[PDB]
Design brief:
The structure is cut from a larger assembly and holds three copies of chain A.
Chain A: H1 30-33
Family (chain B): Belongs to the adenoviridae penton family.
Modified residues (Phosphoserine) (chain B): 40
Subcellular location (chain B): Virion; Host nucleus
Chain lengths: 53, 52, 53
């Protein structure tokens, strides 16, 4: 446990030990770019919830 | 196949109209989860949890 | 040298070994908030060039 438990993003921050990832259909950005011809029982989500990308 | 049965779907009435989710942001306490910008824009505060 | 040479920001990223800080008068945000009644031969700059703050 106490060894390597690192959860590293891009050039952001190491947040070591457990965090949250979100699978959301409602994401304002992606609704246009991807899922255009997809429903709610089959879709793609951006799990990088970073605004600047 | 030609008309509105292909275009659309017969669902039961949703008296709620969406059942959209809300999100908690506790950002002077919780370590902002992976990917989330550490910000001061009240509109981009890191999410710690999401209820319906 | 090879020991601790860490340059850590907020909850951003460790960039170890030498980087750039910028003392700018022109910063669009601060020109209003601070320096209002100051000139160019006496001023305050935000050296956190982070957009999101």
């Amino acid at each position: 446990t106490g060894g390597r438990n690192s959860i590293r993003y891009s050039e952001l921050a190491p947040l070591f030990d457990t965090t949250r990832v979100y699978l959301v259909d409602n994401k304002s950005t992606d609704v246009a770019s991807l899922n255009y011809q997809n429903d709610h029982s089959n879709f793609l989500t951006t799990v990088i919830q970073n605004n600047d990308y | 196949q030609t008309g509105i049965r292909s275009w659309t779907l017969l669902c039961t009435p949703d008296v709620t109209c969406g059942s959209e989710q809300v999100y908690w942001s506790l950002p002077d306490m919780m370590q902002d989860p992976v990917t989330f910008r550490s910000t001061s824009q009240i509109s981009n505060f890191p999410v710690v949890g999401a209820e319906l």
